[PDB]
Design an enzyme around this catalytic site. Structure first.
Site, PDB file in Angstrom:
ATOM      1  N   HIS A 113       2.075   2.249  -3.392  1.00 52.58           N
ATOM      2  CA  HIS A 113       0.913   2.812  -4.187  1.00 52.58           C
ATOM      3  C   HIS A 113       1.035   4.440  -3.852  1.00 52.58           C
ATOM      4  O   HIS A 113       0.624   5.118  -4.880  1.00 52.58           O
ATOM      5  CB  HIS A 113      -0.612   2.305  -3.712  1.00 52.58           C
ATOM      6  CG  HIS A 113      -1.072   1.326  -4.481  1.00 52.58           C
ATOM      7  ND1 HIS A 113      -1.032   1.058  -5.846  1.00 52.58           N
ATOM      8  CD2 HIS A 113      -1.569   0.030  -3.919  1.00 52.58           C
ATOM      9  CE1 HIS A 113      -1.463   0.061  -6.125  1.00 52.58           C
ATOM     10  NE2 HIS A 113      -1.928  -0.658  -5.009  1.00 52.58           N
ATOM     11  N   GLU A 125       0.796  -1.176   0.060  1.00 56.90           N
ATOM     12  CA  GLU A 125      -0.153   0.100   0.141  1.00 56.90           C
ATOM     13  C   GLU A 125       0.866   1.576   0.097  1.00 56.90           C
ATOM     14  O   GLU A 125       0.450   2.187  -0.671  1.00 56.90           O
ATOM     15  CB  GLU A 125      -0.885  -0.005   1.229  1.00 56.90           C
ATOM     16  CG  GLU A 125      -2.014  -1.138   1.128  1.00 56.90           C
ATOM     17  CD  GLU A 125      -2.611  -1.348  -0.321  1.00 56.90           C
ATOM     18  OE1 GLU A 125      -2.799  -0.330  -0.960  1.00 56.90           O
ATOM     19  OE2 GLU A 125      -2.789  -2.494  -0.603  1.00 56.90           O
TER      20      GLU A 125
HETATM   21 NI    NI Z   1      -2.422  -2.687  -4.916  1.00 62.03          NI
END
Ligand code: NI
EC number: 3.5.1.88
Length: 179
Positions: A152, A149
């Site tokens: 990201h 994450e």
């Molecule tokens: Ni992802």
């Protein structure tokens, strides 16, 4: 509520941008977004709701995946369930690890085989929904999810880490998690 239609896919430039720091104190909108993101993860893991809403099971989600370029991530690991604002990795282990089954992502609509090697242990600082700071030590699967994450919000996708030449090469010393 968040649906698959709200999740942008590979090809959308927002997934490769560096997400913006969010204000502290946490805005009511960023608080609401976090709540909706966690609700989405929970719904995606409930067998009935996942079928009703036609959702792919998911343990992590980052704001950029909703076309909101902000440093906000949500995780719901089946042990860790929270929303992290402005998360940062303060330190990590030498020892690395990778999921044996590889990785996937709701923003990726193709199978990309191969190992995604990450750090087995990380210390992460973040602000919760109330703007209070937390410093946590994560490891194993939880560490993998959080690194996925955080990638990201830095514009990185899991397949960026795969060794195309030798997708299943395993170095020395790397751990494997088998879900
Ligand atoms: Ni992802």
């Amino acid at each position: 509520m968040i649906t698959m239609k709200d999740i942008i896919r590979e090809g959308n430039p927002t997934l490769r941008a560096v997400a913006e720091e969010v204000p502290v104190p946490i805005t009511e909108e960023d608080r609401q977004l976090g709540e909706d993101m966690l609700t989405f993860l929970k719904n995606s893991q409930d067998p009935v709701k996942a079928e009703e809403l036609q959702l792919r099971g998911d343990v992590g989600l980052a704001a950029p995946q909703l076309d909101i370029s902000k440093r906000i991530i949500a995780v719901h690991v089946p042990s860790l369930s929270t929303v992290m604002y402005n998360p940062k990795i303060l330190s990590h282990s030498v020892q690395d690890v990778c999921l044996g089954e590889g990785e996937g992502c709701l923003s990726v609509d193709r199978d990309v085989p191969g190992y995604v090697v990450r750090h087995n242990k990380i210390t992460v600082s973040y602000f919760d929904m109330a703007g209070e700071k937390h410093k946590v030590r994560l490891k194993n699967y939880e560490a993998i999810v959080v690194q996925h994450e955080i990638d990201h919000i830095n514009g990185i996708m899991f397949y960026d880490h795969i060794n195309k030449e030798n997708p299943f090469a395993l170095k020395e010393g790397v751990l494997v998690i088998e879900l």
